[PDB]
Amino acid sequence: EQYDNLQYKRYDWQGWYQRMVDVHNRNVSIKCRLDDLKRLDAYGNPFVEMQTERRLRILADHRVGMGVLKLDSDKYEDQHDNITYGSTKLSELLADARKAQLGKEYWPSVEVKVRRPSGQSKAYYSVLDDARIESKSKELYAKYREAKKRSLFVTPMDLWLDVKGM
Amino acid sequence: ANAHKFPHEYHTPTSRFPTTPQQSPASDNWIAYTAKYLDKQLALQDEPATVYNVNKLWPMQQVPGKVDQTPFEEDQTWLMHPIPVHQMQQHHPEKDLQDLPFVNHEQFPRSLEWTAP
Amino acid sequence: GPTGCGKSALLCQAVHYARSRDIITLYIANAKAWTHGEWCWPSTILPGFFDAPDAAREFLRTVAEANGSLLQAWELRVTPQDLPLEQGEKQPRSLYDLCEWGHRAVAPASIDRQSVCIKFFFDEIRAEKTKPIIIAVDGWNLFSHETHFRYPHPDFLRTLTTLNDGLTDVDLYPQELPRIPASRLSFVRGLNKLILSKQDPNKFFITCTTRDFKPFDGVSGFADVENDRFKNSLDEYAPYDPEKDSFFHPMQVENFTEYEYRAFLRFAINSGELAGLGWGPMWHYSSDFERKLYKIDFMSDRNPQRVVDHYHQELVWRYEYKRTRQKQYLLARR
Amino acid sequence: PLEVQRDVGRLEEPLPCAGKIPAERSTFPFRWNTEDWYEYEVAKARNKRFVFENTNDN
Amino acid sequence: LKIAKSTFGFYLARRGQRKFPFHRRPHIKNTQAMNLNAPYFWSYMTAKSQSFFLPEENYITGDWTGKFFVSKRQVYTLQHATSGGKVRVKSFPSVFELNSPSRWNVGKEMNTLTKPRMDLIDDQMLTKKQRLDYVKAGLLPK
Amino acid sequence: APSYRADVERSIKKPTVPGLMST
Amino acid sequence: NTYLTRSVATPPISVIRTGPKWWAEPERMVKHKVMYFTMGIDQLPLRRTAVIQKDLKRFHMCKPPPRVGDATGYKRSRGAQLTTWYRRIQYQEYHLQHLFVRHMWGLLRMYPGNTTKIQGKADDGYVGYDSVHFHRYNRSPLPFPAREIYERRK
Amino acid sequence: STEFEQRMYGIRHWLHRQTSCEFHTTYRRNVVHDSAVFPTEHDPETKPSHEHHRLFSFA
Amino acid sequence: PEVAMHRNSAGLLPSHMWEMDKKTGKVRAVKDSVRDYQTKIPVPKWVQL
Amino acid sequence: WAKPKKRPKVGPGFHEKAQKWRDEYLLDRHRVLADSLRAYVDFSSTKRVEPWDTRFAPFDRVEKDGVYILTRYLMDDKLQLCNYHHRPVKRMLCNVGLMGPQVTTTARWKPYRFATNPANTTRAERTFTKDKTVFTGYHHD
Amino acid sequence: MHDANRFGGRTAYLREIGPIDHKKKGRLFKRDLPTLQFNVDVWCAQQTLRKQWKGRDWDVVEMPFEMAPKELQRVVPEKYTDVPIMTDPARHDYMNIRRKVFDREDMQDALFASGGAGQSPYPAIQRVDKAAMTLDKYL
Amino acid sequence: GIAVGHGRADGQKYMFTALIRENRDHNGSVTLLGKPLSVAFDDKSWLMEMVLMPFDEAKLDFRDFDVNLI
Amino acid sequence: TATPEKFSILGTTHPKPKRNGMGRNNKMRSKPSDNVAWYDKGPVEWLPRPVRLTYDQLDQLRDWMMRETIAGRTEEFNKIRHLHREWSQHPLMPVLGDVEPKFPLNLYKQNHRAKRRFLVRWHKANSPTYWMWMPRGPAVATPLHRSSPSQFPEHWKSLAR
Amino acid sequence: GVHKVGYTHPHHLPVPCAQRWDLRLARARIFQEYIEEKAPGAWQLEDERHMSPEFNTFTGYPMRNLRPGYGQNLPEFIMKKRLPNNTHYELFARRDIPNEDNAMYGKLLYDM
RNA sequence: UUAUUAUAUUUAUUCAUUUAAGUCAACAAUAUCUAUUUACUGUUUUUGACAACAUGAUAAGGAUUAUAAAUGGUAUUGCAAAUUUUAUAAUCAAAACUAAUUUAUUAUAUUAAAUUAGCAUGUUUAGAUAAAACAAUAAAUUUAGAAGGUAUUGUUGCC
């Protein structure tokens, strides 16, 4: 809340400069420490547990920092309106973060970074299809032994690979 | 009509680079490719992926069902793809008011570390 | 071990230990050449497994010239005695001839031929059950992980008739097919098959995880090509655990201690001076050893590779002040 | 070195009262992780405003 | 200015060979309006997208008595080329018209159509001094 | 100040051929 | 050599004069050190030059020794012959560094830049992919593509 | 205390010459999250999708 | 030219509009296209005034 | 002040020299367009000289061996279809991915206007003498 | 300056080759610095983005909370939104959770509860015996 | 046991402070910006040696000292 | 359309000149410059050309010696060691009162390019073939380098008498 | 590799849980935002000159979007454009007037 | 050339931009005791700041006053406060060079959104010529202190 006490205090610019300095301060930084919400409720259910607030943070990614949901309402310039509209968007966010009270499916999915196929397991890619490879390779060399009679260099497309010619 | 033949000059505003090519049919990994083209007889069409969703595009949550592109790992792919360079003047939604780097308009002179409560 | 310690110096010794005792010794002087090489060609004999002829053809040459002594007396157990021999090519009756058979050929006939040889060369190394065999590969970590050779776009297998109606984006946008796991490399399969397949106490693996990766500190624009220390270095950016990404037992090799580092750098400069590759006549401008030892220990952490690069930088050490003071002390005595 | 009487006159001045502090690898020096060092320095810049001062403390 | 080529010579000063910021050069001198780069013939000096709507000057907002000339940002259409009526674009000295219509003009704004720097210069418009400087140049030799 | 003191023999006066252009 | 575009030459002293700026750039003389070192060639002129710069860099801040009137001028003469020596020491090394490198590229098969001579492999000036019709100095119309002096295989 | 605050907003008068001031008030406010208006109910059977979040979707 | 330069073909050329001279191999001139351009959509099809 | 001195009138009847000149120039604009457009298109349909620089690896390797193998077999028909322009081939070649990343880092490529020479450009005098009548921005031939 | 061996060759996007007539030839944006400077900032960012995305040994896989690893069985604040969360102070496990990767062979329980022959996804981990005698122990 | 000092060059463009403690186990290290002095200074001799002078100039041994620079 | 058969004032303007000076102000006619490269003078061209020795060359080179060490192809070395012995002898101490000529003052202004042009031309004439201040050849007693190639240790069996 | 991002609907999993996209959906609903269908996946370029500590001008926020083709005629841009209402330009409209004493009042009223 | 102190010293050079006029005065609408004030009408005699002459006024430019925190000047550079006595010349969208007082990007990768630059390939080559001593690194081929003017703000002086 900033009113002017300078050359901008009295005459005809008293209004529009005052209007500016307030529409330039239309924000109302709504805050609430999430841990405060971990109270009981008048229905008797625990309001917000670890399963719920987890959904809350991911619902407002950059907003909820340092464990305090920070909602800055900058829509309207009537500051009281920003309080009403701000509180409006506020309860809606709790309305959904409370969904994890319902069931397992409403619990958000914790993100787990799993390694690529580890080298130990990537080894088994080598011995994969042991029975078939020995059989198919045993023949392909024969077709190869015949093939190098006709030409100098043979392609994989000669022996096995099927490039879709026509 | 002939747009699908002409890939570039019809770049609508909502369209974005780097353009996502048509997806290789099921070449999601090497086994998917090898079993499809090199070794058809291989039993494992695709190695067992996670039953739960696997968002490789982390942390950029992309719309599902959309043919999506993993950031290019090898440089050769980065330069050769058609990417525009910023020829014309630069514009940004917020600081277009502050016209240039030189002329920084300040509607109100406040300390650059003025933190609105 | 840490990147740039005595990672491969152990290996080169391990072979010198082996080939001195005359045991047959396979040695990949650069596992980079296979997994990170000039080109990668599908093996013609083998379906779904790829070959790298640049290193294979060489590997066949070296395994011949290296163990030509034993491999002559090393008779071939299981391989067809009817491989297509050119006009004037004798039949292989010892493996030594089989490796001669591949690399001694006029390309591009060698490429199709080396794919067969690398398929059967191991067929003898595996079949053996008595002759002790030692397998060494400098850079095993490259064999377990992917290879920068990427599978070709499937349209290369469709023999595209034309472009406009080709429905084909190989010309327009380079898109990345998955990398080829080095375990699909037939020669690496030759090794990897022996690792899993048990009952082979004849073959042994003394291997070294190399770490020469392009150092990335969190932000790295373009390198300065006027002076770029890592252009020939490898580009992985991949964290490697030998535990979960191999079967061999970890032998953690560490930077020198001040004991071994001492006897090394004592050798490194003094013996170098004796061969004339040191200061020589202008020695007295250079500092003594204790300063040269102490200072390098500071800058090098006693890392053997860094020692070399820092030893080469005794040249521009600007703020040495021993000799200029010592000579002034000598002139006082005089 | 701290306990070394570098003094030429006052070799009866004591070592600093902590001459036996324990040196470990975790605490000192501060050799830290690169990408995490980003995550710290960034999150510091954004969380400047998220001060909740209206509390029930003493 | 040293030579007031219009009413705006008396006011503004050359300020030397001043280096304005890019794209903020004050006078909109589109002397590069017609520089034909055939490959980019549809992207050069045109709408960067080919799904924009035509500019305003190609259209009529209200009941006009009549425009003396239609502006140079107007884009030429087939209706322009086929109706054939006198279509005028402002330029020095007085005005330029498209008397000989063609379809090679359809789709390009009038900026790319006219030639701003007419090669034929006026020995009449330039005093003995400024003509002399053209004589040394070889643009107006003697 | 003199650095790299050495005792090799002297040279011959005028050891370089004169320039391409001069007065 | 990744640099192949046309070049501009500067006399030895006009480069030697830059000292620690480019001539005695610390890492540069470390480069030509290793290159000398690895080739089995003794790095005698480099370490001969290295001490020259290292002393000059260390003492570039001080005043010149007080010019007291000496009718003999021996000090001013000694101030010159010791200098022209130092220049002649770097003259040899400056040429020496260019000698081996171009010859070195003869061993790695790296085509040097334009107007560049490798003793045996490119006796006269090599010029490929220039900005002009002809060899800039020999007035020979270039062949397309850029002519090659080494054998194709590795 | 509102009696104190109106001592504060009167500081703007008697400030030293050529010195404007701005106030950053930060007051706790009790807010009712009445579930009657905002019900924490199950998902909609037809889950909305990206098709419901183009431009002007808020409109 | 950025991407699909090779995709262009002589089939895209409106060769009948102009005339070619075999000696120069170039376009000496062009004929009149306003008179003989008979296009069923001067205004597009879905346009109905 | 060099007090701003007037330029005289535009001259009597020069306007007629204007409406004329601008018009029949805009007519010339057509043929130079029609000529250069053809030159651009018919350039795109022709073959180019190979964009790679044979001097540098991996294109020093003999035609029989090396990346010339995959160039000759796996993609041969394709590299002729793309007409050997230096924009598609470096994109096609990057797709095959059987040479790794050595397209950009290792393999050095011909300069731009050296790579727009059409096939059978033997004399190096050629790359600079491309015709001047056409306005293309040096994509033409 | 724009010597084509600069900036990984990507300087070729900004180069007007030859004796240009500064007035008529030569694109404008190639002249002003900040546009040249803003452009290099794009490409230079790519190499970081490339290298950050070449080290993606881990693959992101969501998981219902109940059967996730016991490391992430707590509230996990999003990145850049809190002081880096050391995994477990009491367990002497001080590693950023966003940096802790879990092995695919470790988690074939839920992720591949559809495994049938549970090895069929992947064989189990062969953990090294860190206690019995080996060359490290001089034996 | 930590002593703090301040250093400035180029007027203000460079400012570093050097926390220093006595690493009793003789295996102390000098580190800078979360990396050993090598990685920050790119293993350059003529720079890493300047950081060494203050230790040797005072006749002390840096193996005892643990110095981080901020 | 139908491009008028004779153009009224398109070609009827004034002729335009083509620039005929290969350089600044379009005046510098072709003439042998100072930048000319005398390939004859010594194994390197004089003047030398800008030579960069990047770390890619070294590491590639280090692989190269891995060949001529084991392949025994020591000959390619034997050009070097002789190329170094000749071109690295101790440069003789110049005699008192001798110096390279500097540009004589007052002949031109200080800013006129005639300052550097003379220095370059003087440094052209003193090609390394004319470098007499440095000794070399057969008569110079080489105390540092061994004389014969077999004295280099790769022929250690022959060194053993 | 270019793929089709999978959305396993949370129901048909062994142990159900709200997929992360569902939250990303449920967020955009609350704070009315625009989910772009044609957003590229490869283009995750962060403003390095600002959001990295080692750089000189570390502001922590992404100042400029490194999309070079970004213009004001774009649709998404105009959604986020700042209207000039009550900005620097308003102040300059009323304060930067020829006779700065006239903004205070009409002069006649004063001389009255 | 008189008995705490250094010029010899690289790094550069092709650069241009401006449009199509309009000042002869002031006027609460909500929540404070009521005014239609709702829609507060009264007909016309001058020529400076201009397209023109019209006094002042702050700059560019180095050459001989720091050893324990400083390298840019006043004589004057378009729009400024007493000389008036032809005359609207002002930015608005879409617009045409002749101009002394200017870093333009030179061959691994190159146009994404208010409209933005196609000909000049020719040995980083004529003559002219540009700018440093400052958190960097060049410290000497060398300095107060004697000198004349026909001019008389003084050599672009006069004769």
PDB file of N, CA, C and O in Angstrom, chain C residues 274-298:
ATOM      1  N   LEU C 274      69.303 -38.212 -19.194  1.00  0.00           N
ATOM      2  CA  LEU C 274      70.428 -39.015 -19.655  1.00  0.00           C
ATOM      3  C   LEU C 274      70.325 -39.290 -21.147  1.00  0.00           C
ATOM      4  O   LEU C 274      71.343 -39.409 -21.837  1.00  0.00           O
ATOM      5  N   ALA C 275      69.099 -39.386 -21.664  1.00  0.00           N
ATOM      6  CA  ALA C 275      68.918 -39.657 -23.086  1.00  0.00           C
ATOM      7  C   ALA C 275      68.930 -38.372 -23.900  1.00  0.00           C
ATOM      8  O   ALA C 275      68.711 -38.395 -25.116  1.00  0.00           O
ATOM      9  N   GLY C 276      69.177 -37.240 -23.249  1.00  0.00           N
ATOM     10  CA  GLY C 276      69.267 -35.968 -23.928  1.00  0.00           C
ATOM     11  C   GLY C 276      67.955 -35.258 -24.148  1.00  0.00           C
ATOM     12  O   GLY C 276      67.965 -34.100 -24.579  1.00  0.00           O
ATOM     13  N   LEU C 277      66.828 -35.902 -23.865  1.00  0.00           N
ATOM     14  CA  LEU C 277      65.521 -35.281 -24.004  1.00  0.00           C
ATOM     15  C   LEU C 277      65.194 -34.336 -22.856  1.00  0.00           C
ATOM     16  O   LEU C 277      64.040 -33.922 -22.719  1.00  0.00           O
ATOM     17  N   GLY C 278      66.177 -33.989 -22.032  1.00  0.00           N
ATOM     18  CA  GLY C 278      65.965 -33.054 -20.948  1.00  0.00           C
ATOM     19  C   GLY C 278      66.676 -31.744 -21.197  1.00  0.00           C
ATOM     20  O   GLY C 278      66.998 -31.421 -22.343  1.00  0.00           O
ATOM     21  N   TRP C 279      66.928 -30.979 -20.136  1.00  0.00           N
ATOM     22  CA  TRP C 279      67.577 -29.684 -20.299  1.00  0.00           C
ATOM     23  C   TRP C 279      68.981 -29.838 -20.865  1.00  0.00           C
ATOM     24  O   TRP C 279      69.352 -29.160 -21.829  1.00  0.00           O
ATOM     25  N   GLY C 280      69.773 -30.732 -20.287  1.00  0.00           N
ATOM     26  CA  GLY C 280      71.133 -30.926 -20.723  1.00  0.00           C
ATOM     27  C   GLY C 280      72.048 -29.806 -20.276  1.00  0.00           C
ATOM     28  O   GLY C 280      72.242 -29.572 -19.080  1.00  0.00           O
ATOM     29  N   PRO C 281      72.627 -29.084 -21.236  1.00  0.00           N
ATOM     30  CA  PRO C 281      73.593 -28.032 -20.880  1.00  0.00           C
ATOM     31  C   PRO C 281      72.992 -26.922 -20.046  1.00  0.00           C
ATOM     32  O   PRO C 281      73.681 -26.373 -19.178  1.00  0.00           O
ATOM     33  N   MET C 282      71.726 -26.577 -20.272  1.00  0.00           N
ATOM     34  CA  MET C 282      71.049 -25.526 -19.528  1.00  0.00           C
ATOM     35  C   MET C 282      70.310 -26.075 -18.318  1.00  0.00           C
ATOM     36  O   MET C 282      69.284 -25.522 -17.910  1.00  0.00           O
ATOM     37  N   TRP C 283      70.807 -27.175 -17.753  1.00  0.00           N
ATOM     38  CA  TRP C 283      70.201 -27.737 -16.554  1.00  0.00           C
ATOM     39  C   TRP C 283      70.132 -26.722 -15.424  1.00  0.00           C
ATOM     40  O   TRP C 283      69.135 -26.675 -14.696  1.00  0.00           O
ATOM     41  N   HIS C 284      71.169 -25.898 -15.266  1.00  0.00           N
ATOM     42  CA  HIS C 284      71.271 -25.065 -14.072  1.00  0.00           C
ATOM     43  C   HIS C 284      70.202 -23.984 -14.045  1.00  0.00           C
ATOM     44  O   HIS C 284      69.929 -23.401 -12.992  1.00  0.00           O
ATOM     45  N   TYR C 285      69.591 -23.686 -15.191  1.00  0.00           N
ATOM     46  CA  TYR C 285      68.433 -22.799 -15.175  1.00  0.00           C
ATOM     47  C   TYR C 285      67.215 -23.512 -14.611  1.00  0.00           C
ATOM     48  O   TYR C 285      66.397 -22.905 -13.912  1.00  0.00           O
ATOM     49  N   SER C 286      67.078 -24.799 -14.905  1.00  0.00           N
ATOM     50  CA  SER C 286      66.015 -25.589 -14.310  1.00  0.00           C
ATOM     51  C   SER C 286      66.262 -25.773 -12.819  1.00  0.00           C
ATOM     52  O   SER C 286      67.401 -25.799 -12.347  1.00  0.00           O
ATOM     53  N   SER C 287      65.172 -25.914 -12.076  1.00  0.00           N
ATOM     54  CA  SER C 287      65.276 -26.150 -10.649  1.00  0.00           C
ATOM     55  C   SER C 287      65.813 -27.552 -10.380  1.00  0.00           C
ATOM     56  O   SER C 287      66.043 -28.348 -11.293  1.00  0.00           O
ATOM     57  N   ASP C 288      66.007 -27.856  -9.102  1.00  0.00           N
ATOM     58  CA  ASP C 288      66.460 -29.182  -8.721  1.00  0.00           C
ATOM     59  C   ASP C 288      65.289 -30.157  -8.761  1.00  0.00           C
ATOM     60  O   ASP C 288      64.204 -29.847  -9.253  1.00  0.00           O
ATOM     61  N   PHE C 289      65.517 -31.361  -8.237  1.00  0.00           N
ATOM     62  CA  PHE C 289      64.455 -32.361  -8.257  1.00  0.00           C
ATOM     63  C   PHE C 289      63.451 -32.122  -7.140  1.00  0.00           C
ATOM     64  O   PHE C 289      62.239 -32.120  -7.384  1.00  0.00           O
ATOM     65  N   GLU C 290      63.934 -31.938  -5.909  1.00  0.00           N
ATOM     66  CA  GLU C 290      63.035 -31.776  -4.769  1.00  0.00           C
ATOM     67  C   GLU C 290      61.974 -30.719  -5.038  1.00  0.00           C
ATOM     68  O   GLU C 290      60.785 -30.946  -4.788  1.00  0.00           O
ATOM     69  N   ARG C 291      62.379 -29.561  -5.554  1.00  0.00           N
ATOM     70  CA  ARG C 291      61.395 -28.573  -5.975  1.00  0.00           C
ATOM     71  C   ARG C 291      60.550 -29.105  -7.124  1.00  0.00           C
ATOM     72  O   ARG C 291      59.320 -28.994  -7.100  1.00  0.00           O
ATOM     73  N   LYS C 292      61.191 -29.699  -8.132  1.00  0.00           N
ATOM     74  CA  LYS C 292      60.444 -30.236  -9.264  1.00  0.00           C
ATOM     75  C   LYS C 292      59.533 -31.372  -8.828  1.00  0.00           C
ATOM     76  O   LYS C 292      58.447 -31.555  -9.383  1.00  0.00           O
ATOM     77  N   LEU C 293      59.959 -32.148  -7.836  1.00  0.00           N
ATOM     78  CA  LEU C 293      59.094 -33.187  -7.296  1.00  0.00           C
ATOM     79  C   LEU C 293      57.957 -32.583  -6.493  1.00  0.00           C
ATOM     80  O   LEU C 293      56.785 -32.885  -6.736  1.00  0.00           O
ATOM     81  N   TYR C 294      58.290 -31.733  -5.526  1.00  0.00           N
ATOM     82  CA  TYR C 294      57.282 -31.158  -4.646  1.00  0.00           C
ATOM     83  C   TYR C 294      56.232 -30.389  -5.437  1.00  0.00           C
ATOM     84  O   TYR C 294      55.029 -30.543  -5.207  1.00  0.00           O
ATOM     85  N   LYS C 295      56.674 -29.555  -6.381  1.00  0.00           N
ATOM     86  CA  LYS C 295      55.742 -28.731  -7.142  1.00  0.00           C
ATOM     87  C   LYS C 295      54.783 -29.585  -7.963  1.00  0.00           C
ATOM     88  O   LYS C 295      53.579 -29.309  -8.008  1.00  0.00           O
ATOM     89  N   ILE C 296      55.295 -30.620  -8.631  1.00  0.00           N
ATOM     90  CA  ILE C 296      54.429 -31.464  -9.451  1.00  0.00           C
ATOM     91  C   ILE C 296      53.436 -32.218  -8.581  1.00  0.00           C
ATOM     92  O   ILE C 296      52.267 -32.377  -8.948  1.00  0.00           O
ATOM     93  N   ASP C 297      53.879 -32.689  -7.416  1.00  0.00           N
ATOM     94  CA  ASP C 297      52.950 -33.318  -6.485  1.00  0.00           C
ATOM     95  C   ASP C 297      51.774 -32.397  -6.191  1.00  0.00           C
ATOM     96  O   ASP C 297      50.629 -32.850  -6.092  1.00  0.00           O
ATOM     97  N   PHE C 298      52.038 -31.098  -6.057  1.00  0.00           N
ATOM     98  CA  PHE C 298      50.958 -30.143  -5.850  1.00  0.00           C
ATOM     99  C   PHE C 298      49.995 -30.148  -7.025  1.00  0.00           C
ATOM    100  O   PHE C 298      48.787 -30.336  -6.856  1.00  0.00           O
TER     101      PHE C 298
END
